[PDB]
UniProtKB/Swiss-Prot annotation:
It comes from Escherichia coli (strain K12). PANTHER family: PUROMYCIN-SENSITIVE AMINOPEPTIDASE. Keywords: Aminopeptidase, Cell inner membrane, Cell membrane, Hydrolase, Membrane, Metal-binding, Metalloprotease, Protease, Zinc. GO terms for biological process: proteolysis. This is Aminopeptidase N. Zn(2+) binds at H293, H297, E316. The record marks Y377 as: Transition state stabilizer. Binds 1 zinc ion per subunit.
């Protein structure tokens, strides 16, 4: 399979302006009739090249003439000798029931639904399946009325009828031209929650959430979140919904999270269905963010779309930024920022050091479904947030306004967005653009000097990005480097130079530069890279007491968290080295005292406290190291938890009890208390066994909501408490019928520290709630094992690698997109020791030799083995 390259982009030889689709729907055999109005832009001798995958072509007509001048080739229908303007008619057949890959038109339980992004429409009919071809769609759906009483596509209903033999039909029209990735069709029998939103200017919008029969009890929060998203986009961005109906359909079988199809979003049910006994606080907040995300795409993605798939971050980075801002404005901004930082440093940094490393605007792609990445999404959003930091809110919004004014109704590029920001604000972003074309994480090194004679403080800041496997050449970036300087009482020292204020966002644009500050009356403690102002590794030689000082005094909640992370990082590293030498955990008394102070500080927001008291994950720990020892990291994490549980026992219990709440509410103050209480519970679980067992068992049994029940269950598993097996069985007996709820349980099994975890996981492949046919189940059992239990995955006998090989051998054929997500832990082999590396390479070579290796896997495997 051949790579495609960004620099090869060329405007299409033909456009399609309007397409009329008819589907004669049936799960075994669906007949598609597609009538397109086309226009030639290129040379008169250029053929029309249509994409198509696994279609059975029935006929081809041009202006109602059966056509002879065409050929099928691999992935294509090539049509020659055309007029300049014509009507193309294609008839073809497809088979939804055979579609295990869940790309194109497929079955989800008894429903039929589509997934077209990135290149799935070509699995439905022969088309210009490229996002710079925007057309007006009309869609007629004909189906069995009993089996498919709801027939939905984008837009509004324009026609409806009933036929003989139990069939009926509905035709839809969407007035906005769209690329075909935004096409959707759904057919099935649903319960429908109906509501309304009235936009600021008075447009009335019918809101319709479609869920499987019997799930209406789990729909209101998603509907509430949709209305919250619509109000927020109006208040913050000045954007209103542009159509008359907003449909969301929740489907159980879905490879990703959710999809912004215009007026007809299709969601993984995981990001729709919640009630207090089935869903945790984190599930509620994920629903809210994903509902918001897809909604936000209506402007950033749909009204302005992507010229080509290399521009994916134009919509994904921007829309992630918007979802984060939405979450942050409605909820705790500090907690949102902390968690987005944890993702960046712990999961995205690892990708940017991997064989799959790419810039946020990639240059080369084999399979575009492989580039729906942490880099494109999360690092993309950090790049947008850097623009926001450089411009300020008002200028950023002027940029958004200029972007839409220029590009509304068109497919645009990352560069067009940057230019809009630059033009609206008059901030020069020429150098800044390199963030789009350069991969890897910059390392920023800071040294300081305080001169008491002149009362000047000097920061010497250097940057470099290490070469990555994709790019041998790197240059300095325009790094917005936010600082704050604290005096000995914890007060901010005004930044100034030569008698004028200096902006606290430093423009670090060179390999090395110095910044000098005047009137610095006390040696400062710096807060550096404030609110993670650029997506960089910071190297500054902090003393422990500078960090604990920041934990007590820093003005932004984020900086207090971050200082705690820097303090812990030193001792994590220490103790991994010690583990390798067979020595037990060592931690200074003063480090423990810093965490005790957080627990007893009444002035700290409990949301902030909870996050300081949540240890970095094993993924975040791994990025502290050049070579990862995943067993040492897992055992050090557990030992640190046990040490703090012992040293802080009485305080932990006291805070645990003080944050008890009898009423459950999905409200941010309540969520914050509960997060703190359950952070305390995690340590208490790892304390003296009898007390731990009683506390955990009681919380599980008395919980009035899934957040509390799961936090108890998860603690019983992590600490291997006596009550564990009984609680796990109780959960299974109560919830086995509910796949979303069982996913939590599969995660706990897959991430268990028990010595026989792999044997248990393999056994769970036959569990009543597990199926290889369902991406959520795969993720929750297999994916959690490979990706979230790196200790067991990287077991020295190589058993974790062999297990993943077997699963991937199945999934390569069944569902290559899911396969490719699951292979990611194996392609990190160069971060591990020689003996692991050998075993991981042997596993990759086995997969490389699969019959019918998917392009999705081929791309990753060949990068990994290079
Ligand atoms: C591949 C698609 C399901 C991704 C979707 N456009 C998103 O917003 O994440
Ligand atoms: Na198939
Ligand atoms: Na067009
Ligand atoms: Na009707
Ligand atoms: Na298109
Ligand atoms: Na907020
Ligand atoms: Na492809
Ligand atoms: Na410029
Ligand atoms: Na110094
Ligand atoms: Na220093
Ligand atoms: Na350091
Ligand atoms: Na099963
Ligand atoms: Zn998106």
């Amino acid at each position: 399979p051949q790579a495609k390259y960004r620099h090869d982009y060329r405007a299409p030889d033909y456009q399609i302006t309007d397409i009329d689709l008819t589907f004669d729907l049936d799960a075994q055999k669906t007949v598609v009739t597609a009538v397109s109005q086309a226009v030639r832009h290129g040379a008169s001798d250029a053929p029309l090249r249509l994409n198509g995958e696994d279609l059975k072509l029935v006929s081809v007509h041009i202006n109602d003439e059966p056509w002879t001048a065409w050929k099928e080739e691999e992935g294509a229908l090539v049509i020659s000798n055309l007029p300049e303007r014509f009507t193309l008619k294609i008839i073809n057949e497809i088979s939804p029931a055979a579609n295990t890959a869940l790309e194109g038109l497929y079955q989800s339980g008894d429903a039929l639904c589509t997934q077209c992004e990135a290149e799935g429409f070509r699995h439905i009919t022969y088309y210009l399946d490229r996002p710079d071809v925007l057309a007006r769609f009309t869609t007629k759906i004909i189906a069995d009325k009993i089996k498919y009483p709801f027939l939905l596509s984008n837009g509004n209903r324009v026609a409806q009828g009933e036929l003989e033999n139990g069939r009926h039909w509905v035709q839809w029209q969407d007035p906005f031209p769209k690329p075909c990735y935004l096409f959707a069709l759904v057919a099935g029998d649903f319960d429908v929650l109906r509501d309304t939103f009235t936009t600021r200017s008075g447009r009335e919008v019918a809101l319709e959430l479609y869920v499987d029969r019997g799930n209406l009890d789990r729909a209101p929060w998603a509907m509430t979140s949709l209305k919250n998203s619509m109000k927020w986009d109006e208040e913050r961005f000045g954007l209103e919904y542009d159509l008359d109906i907003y449909m969301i359909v929740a489907v159980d079988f879905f490879n990703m999270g959710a999809m912004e199809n215009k007026g007809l979003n299709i969601f993984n049910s995981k990001y729709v269905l919640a009630r207090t006994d089935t869903a945790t606080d984190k599930d509620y907040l994920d629903i809210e963010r994903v509902i918001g995300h897809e909604y936000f795409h209506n402007w950033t993605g749909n009204r302005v779309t992507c010229r080509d798939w290399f521009q994916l971050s134009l919509k994904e980075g921007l829309t992630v930024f918007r979802d984060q801002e939405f979450s942050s404005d409605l909820g705790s901004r500090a907690v949102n920022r902390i968690n987005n930082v944890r993702t960046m440093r712990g999961l995205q940094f690892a990708e940017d050091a991997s064989p799959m490393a790419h810039p946020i605007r990639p240059d080369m792609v084999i399979e575009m479904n492989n580039f729906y990445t942490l880099t494109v999404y999360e690092k993309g959003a950090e790049v947008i947030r850097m623009i926001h930091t450089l411009l300020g809110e008002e200028n950023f919004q002027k940029g958004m306004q200029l972007y839409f004014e220029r590009h509304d109704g068109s497919a645009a590029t990352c560069d067009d967005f940057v230019q809009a920001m630059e033009d609206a604000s008059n901030v020069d972003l020429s150098h800044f653009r390199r963030w789009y074309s350069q991969s890897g994480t910059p390392i920023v090194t800071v040294k300081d000097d305080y001169n008491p004679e002149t009362e000047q403080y000097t920061l010497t800041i250097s940057q470099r990005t290490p070469a990555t496997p994709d790019q041998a050449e790197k240059q300095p970036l325009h790094i917005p480097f936010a600082i704050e300087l604290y005096d000995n009482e914890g007060k901010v020292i005004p930044l100034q130079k030569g008698g004028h204020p200096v902006n606290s966002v430093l423009n670090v644009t060179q390999a090395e530069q110095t910044f000098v500050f005047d009137n610095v009356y006390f040696q400062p403690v710096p807060a550096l890279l404030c609110e993670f102002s650029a997506p960089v590794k910071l190297e500054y030689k902090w003393s422990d007491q500078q960090l604990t000082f920041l934990m007590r005094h820093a003005r932004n909640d984020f900086s207090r968290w971050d200082a705690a992370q820097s303090l812990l990082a030193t001792y994590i590293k220490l103790n991994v080295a010690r583990h390798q030498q067979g020595q037990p955990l060592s931690l200074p008394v003063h480090v423990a005292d810093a965490f005790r102070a957080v627990l007893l500080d009444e002035k700290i927001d409990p949301a902030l406290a909870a996050e300081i008291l949540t240890l970095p994950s094993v993924n975040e720990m791994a990025e502290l190291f050049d070579i990862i020892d995943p067993i040492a990291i897992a055992e050090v994490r557990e030992a640190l938890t046990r040490t703090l549980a012992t040293e802080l026992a009485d305080e932990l219990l006291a805070i645990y009890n003080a944050n008890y709440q009898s009423e459950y509410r999905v409200e941010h103050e309540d969520i914050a208390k509960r997060t703190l209480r359950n952070a305390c519970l995690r340590f208490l679980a790892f304390g003296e066994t009898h007390l731990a067992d009683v506390l955990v068992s009681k919380q599980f049994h008395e919980a009035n909501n899934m957040t509390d029940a799961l936090a108890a269950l998860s603690a019983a598993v992590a600490a291997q408490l006596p009550c564990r097996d009984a609680l796990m069985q109780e959960y299974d007996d109560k919830w086995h019928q509910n796949g979303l709820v069982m996913d939590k349980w599969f995660i706990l099994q897959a991430t268990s520290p028990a010595a026989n975890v792999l044997e248990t996981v393999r056994g769970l492949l036959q569990h009543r709630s597990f199926t290889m046919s369902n991406p959520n189940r795969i993720r929750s059992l297999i994916g959690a094992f490979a990706g979230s239990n790196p200790a067991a995955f990287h077991a020295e006998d190589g058993s974790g690698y062999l297990f993943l090989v077997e699963m991937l051998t199945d999934l390569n054929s069944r569902n290559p997109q899911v396969a490719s997500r699951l292979i990611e832990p194996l392609i990190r082999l160069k971060r591990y020791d020689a003996k692991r590396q050998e075993k991981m390479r042997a596993a990759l070579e086995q997969l490389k030799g699969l019959e019918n290796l998917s392009g999705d896997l081929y791309e990753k495997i060949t990068k990994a083995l290079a």
